[PDB]
Symmetry: C2
Subunit: 521 residues, 2 copies
């Protein structure tokens, strides 16, 4: 009586919501951690203060001056990592290595943009492309520019990456001079709020540049105006509710959606059991099923393998999944901790029961005793591997996402005329647009060709082969220099991609003028 109620940071001040708030709990032990509440906040003043005071203050700084602030945030978060790992263990139930993906993946992405931003220099707008003549005598020309939007960036973030979900978006928004309002998902909000508190307490950014609201979302979209941008990460259903709001349909504010995705892994026809690419496929499937207990939007959900390879693949995945120990991440023998909440436990188990209506369960370690955890309290789900023998007539295989340590293997028919993986491509496309597909072969040139065939349906194609066993950055790990997003079911969004992320935060304009006026910006 009672755990800490975490304050919101709005209009440059720390303000508590009213009422009892919503308790965040440890998903292994059931302990009450902290509470949130957005009840009673003055949302009009929160958004106006950020839009006017925050934006004016950030726009007065150059890109390089904002990058320097980002670099100062890096050093701050680096110094406080021990506090962040203790929050992540308790609130998210992740192993240290899995919590590093959030915490140190966040810090690495912020540092990447601090470095990119230093290169942009001491200016207040960016050139887009080169100058172009608009006249035979070259007296009149055009230059396109990017200028920071006179709005706010509202981030409605998913539960699985409280730190990286914040920094992957906030690094390009703040480098672009746009003030940020983050709204983390309630169940795991604590790390987000503590990182925002540490950065606000250090006074590195101007008042109004960084705000946080935790608790109910009611009322937030009603404050969004036509120069604002919104970045939503979460379910496709929720996204479709947000898309209908007047902020987007009437006022035209920008929206980015990152949603559900049934990411594929395709084992190439050449990559037979006696070849090194085969073991890289089994290892990457097990890693993407088990890191964060499969709670990445980019995890492999569908693995397509030649018909001839079906049994050796199932045998090899079963042997490797059996080495994944499950339980309390405080125990150094545990390889995989819990899902983020008991509610997500129930949702994952429903989703496993749903898939089992159409697929055979090949591997399920649910009966292996948990390590230092009570299965009636903890939100630990064991790996489950499904096999779908006829993926062409399968419904659920290509439609139903289980956001847990769950994946389905299906065979495809190798094409033996003139790509051998043509059927696998078609099957991946049945996912109706995904964030990522990975492909595995012993032949690097072949992978460049197959990748082009998956590019129109996947925001990223990730090719693993023996030459890069040591250097490939992971199927599900999002490198900030690369695009993150995908068409169709994955939301039609784009994030990251290095400098490509700044466009969402800017307004592009064609300036057409005397050529002298053009030369000097």
């Amino acid at each position: 009586h009672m755990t800490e109620l975490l304050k919101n940071h709005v209009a440059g001040q720390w303000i508590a919501g009213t009422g009892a708030g919503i308790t965040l709990t440890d998903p292994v032990t059931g302990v009450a951690l902290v509470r949130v509440s957005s009840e009673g906040l003055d949302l009009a003043r929160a958004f106006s203060f950020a839009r006017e005071d925050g934006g004016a203050a950030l726009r007065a700084l150059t890109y390089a001056q904002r990058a320097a602030r980002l670099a100062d945030i890096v050093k701050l978060l680096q110094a406080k990592r021990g506090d962040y790992y203790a929050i992540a263990t308790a609130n998210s139930g992740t192993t240290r290595n899995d919590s590093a993906v959030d915490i140190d993946g966040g810090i690495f992405t912020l540092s990447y943009y601090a470095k990119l931003g230093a290169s942009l220099g001491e200016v207040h707008a960016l050139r887009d492309g080169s100058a172009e003549s608009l006249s035979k005598d070259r007296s009149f020309s055009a230059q396109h520019v990017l200028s920071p939007t006179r709005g706010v960036a509202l981030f409605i973030n998913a539960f699985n990456f409280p730190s990286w979900g914040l920094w992957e978006k906030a690094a390009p928004a703040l480098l672009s001079g746009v003030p940020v309002i983050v709204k983390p998902a309630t169940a795991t909000a604590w790390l987000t709020q503590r990182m925002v508190a540490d950065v606000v307490d250090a006074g590195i950014l101007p008042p109004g540049a960084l705000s946080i609201i935790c608790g109910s979302s009611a009322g937030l979209l009603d404050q969004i105006r036509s120069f604002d941008v919104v970045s939503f990460t979460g379910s496709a259903d929720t996204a479709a509710t947000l898309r209908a709001h007047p902020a987007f349909v009437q006022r035209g504010a920008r929206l980015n959606v990152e949603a559900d995705s049934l990411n594929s892994a395709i084992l190439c026809a050449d990559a037979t059991p006696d070849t090194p690419a085969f073991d890289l496929f089994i290892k990457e499937v097990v890693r993407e099923m088990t890191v964060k207990s499969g709670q990445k939007a980019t995890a492999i959900r569908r693995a397509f393998v030649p018909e001839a390879a079906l049994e050796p693949v199932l045998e090899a995945l079963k042997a490797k999944l059996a080495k994944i120990t499950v339980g309390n991440p405080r125990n150094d023998a545990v390889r995989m901790g819990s899902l983020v909440s008991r509610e997500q436990y129930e949702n994952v188990l429903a989703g496993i029961a749903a898939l089992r209506e159409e697929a055979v369960l090949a591997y399920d370690s649910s009966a292996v005793p948990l390590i230092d955890a009570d299965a009636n309290i903890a939100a630990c789900v064991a790996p489950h591997l499904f096999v779908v023998n006829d993926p062409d007539n399968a419904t659920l295989l290509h439609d139903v996402e289980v956001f847990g340590p769950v994946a389905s293997v299906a065979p495809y028919r190798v094409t033996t005329d003139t790509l051998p993986e043509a059927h696998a491509v078609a099957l991946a496309r049945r996912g109706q647009g995904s964030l990522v597909a990975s492909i595995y072969s012993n032949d690097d040139a072949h992978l460049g060709r197959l990748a082009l065939e998956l590019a129109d349906s996947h925001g990223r194609v990730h090719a693993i082969s023996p030459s890069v066993q040591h250097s490939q950055t992971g199927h599900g790990n999002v490198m900030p220099m690369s695009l993150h997003g995908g068409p169709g079911r994955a939301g039609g969004g784009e994030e990251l991609g290095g400098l490509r992320a700044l466009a969402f935060y800017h307004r592009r304009s064609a300036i057409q003028a005397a050529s002298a006026a053009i030369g000097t910006l």
Copy 2:
């Protein structure tokens, strides 16, 4: 016996809509011209044949092969211009010079993209930027690529540019390998239909690459799927209607909007009545009020001038507006023809009465008899110039667009940039396609343009050194972006190569060096 019912081109066939159809009429003479109807069409097959056959056939071609098809369309349109000018005179009521903005504007933009497109090369995917190492030893890298979306592009186009609105969209779409379904505005659909009929009858593009539906738009959006794209031009209110549809809210199809825009012209403080930039401002205002009777979305609607220059600017605009004779475009003495319809005529006259409740009418030649037209049949409206002396507290100036030969002048307090108040005033239009700025000092234009750029999709600076070369406040050069934030729709079109992204899917490919090389051999981007 009735006027011609224009057929639709859908699923590779010409099909008539059923019923009596909708009559299009000459807005000067009231003569019935042609009819349209989309009643009874099989929209499911219209969209699937386009998406499947037309998309596969265009994607089998390289960029440079598609560009060469665009170039053959330019030659076909150029040969048929006499027919297009006759249809524009009758259906739109524009002078020859003004009809040229649509017809020759549309052919110029298509030819621009045919030339540009030849530089995209003999490949099926485009390279976006360069490889970036993901590894200390450089064994593993990332290359982004652009692939044509496996969808259709649906164009819902505005009345004012039946030719340019089609080709400014269709050139980058077909260059990108995406099949087109165009739905022109009904009132002026004839030229769009006839240009699509000439092109389809020539067999330049594969079957399914180019379709047209005229008449009711019922049921079109219901056929849009998640890899399709839609490009809308028209009113902000219609755009917000479309945005709510499931095609966008549930299925995520891309949508571009080009909408209402109260575009500004700002006379800089140095550009006093004794200087050359002053006269360039008076001329550009008059041209944008009068070309097509002001029915460009980019026309100047708000002209902001220093307080001291207000009276000389009104005097000078009056004198130049009075040279504009109005009437039948068949008569060579006429400098400005009609609006596109009698419904637009009634909207514009209601909008003029609305503005007049809050502004002084400084010029109006409505009492001058029309040349070879009956003012009670013709949709002609004379130029009207309003003056708003207090634009800070003005309740309509910054919010109400009259899509006719109508503009408002307002003074600003000279100040920081001398034009700071004019920039704030321009921003009160809530986001526009274009602002133009006028000064004798080319060293002053860049700073002021940067201050307008976050609220305008284009900033067009006119000064004496470019009196002979500047391309026009309202004329949309295809190499430059067209679109604007806020009220103007939040969209982007044209901008040369920038127009291709709307029709492609971007992907990051992360792979061994040799796989990056193999995929790179199959892409291109111009130098």
